[PDB]
Design a protein around this ligand. Sequence first.
Ligand SMILES: Nc1cc(C(F)(F)F)ncn1
Length: 229
Amino acid sequence: NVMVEPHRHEGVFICDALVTKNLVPGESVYGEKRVSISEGDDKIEYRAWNPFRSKLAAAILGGVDQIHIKPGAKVLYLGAASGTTVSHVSDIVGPDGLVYAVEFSHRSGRDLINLAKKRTNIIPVIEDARHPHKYRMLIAMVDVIFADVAQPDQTRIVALNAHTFLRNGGHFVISIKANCIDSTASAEAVFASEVKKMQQENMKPQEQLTLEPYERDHAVVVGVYRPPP
Ligand SMILES: Nc1cc(C(F)(F)F)ncn1
């Protein structure tokens, strides 16, 4: 009997509870349940991934086609907060991947620094994502940008970071809380407006979904970056 199965997304697993392979066996990050499966001399531990805390987990359970975050990927994570979702991104990309965790809160930044002490593949970047010139010398070209900055101007922020750091043909995954962009607009109006702006920066959406029942009026947009020569 096989208890934990590879999910369709590489690096993600099931048992429906979503889990990731714990990069730091023995440690929880935010109180999450851990499941360790021993067989002979083999041993593997997984970490439960809460979709009521993590928009990426909510999107995966909601049936997103691609997340692009995968083993070996280099990920620029804008709005890393205290590292809840970042820790699972770190699990997914694994030892040969990289996660830049950009977060401008010094309080949350201390959580990220503690998280990255154990996880060699996390680089904490305690900076304002509006001013990538301040940290551009730290960030190697990445495969994916994940953005959860929850600002009216977050599309322009993500675009600015994409133009600096994202490889041609790399991908983006953007979390959009509608009332953080414009609380006097309908969710549909916000999402249409942000998708339109993305297209104008050669950030081409390939799918979009909302996150019910985990969140209200919250979208994830996944797409591909195809900038001009
Ligand atoms: N949580 C955040 C937000 C930002 C922002 F707003 F400046 F883009 N930069 C970094 N972390």
